[PDB]
Design a protein around this ligand. Structure first.
Ligand SMILES: C=C(C)[C@@H]1CCC(C)=C[C@H]1c1c(O)cc(O)cc1CCCCC
Length: 134
């Protein structure tokens, strides 16, 4: 494990378009989504996490415990129900989102004090990095 906690500013983002296409996000929504640049806020306490993705249009957050399956409504995203599970893959926090789409999930890790994220669905990987905001 690693301490991923913090307030994180999006610094780079690659292939968000392909990830959203894999999710079927509509044309006008993809346009807006690529402009929003949400702040990522990770609250981490032992095995308990709350990960926020915050923008002016709306916030999304997920609250979970490592190793504890939970249904995720994805409301405000693609609105598809998944059964999600987050576990540590060495020092990379890995979420499997079981549902209609294949190979759907995300992974966070930290390199120095730089936060990394892959969001992926059916072969489309969106790679983002972040810097600590404050
Ligand atoms: C929760 C949000 C701030 C937005 C909400 C609206 C959409 C369609 C995408 C989210 C979004 C965004 O607009 C930019 C991002 O870099 C990441 C994400 C979260 C993942 C969205 C996957 C559909």
């Amino acid at each position: 494990p690693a301490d991923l906690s913090g307030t994180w500013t999006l610094l780079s983002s690659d292939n968000f378009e392909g990830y959203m296409l894999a999710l079927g996000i509509d044309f006008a929504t993809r346009k807006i989504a690529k402009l929003l640049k949400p702040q990522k806020v990770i609250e981490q306490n032992g095995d308990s996490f709350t990960i926020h993705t915050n923008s002016s249009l709306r916030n999304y957050f997920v609250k979970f415990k490592v190793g504890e399956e939970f249904d995720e409504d994805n409301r405000g995203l693609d609105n598809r129900k998944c059964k999600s599970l987050v576990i540590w893959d060495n020092d990379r926090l890995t979420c499997i989102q079981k549902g209609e789409k294949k190979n759907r999930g995300w992974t966070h890790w930290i390199e120095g004090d730089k936060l990394h994220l892959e969001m992926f669905c059916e072969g489309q990987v969106c790679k983002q990095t972040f810097q600590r905001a404050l």
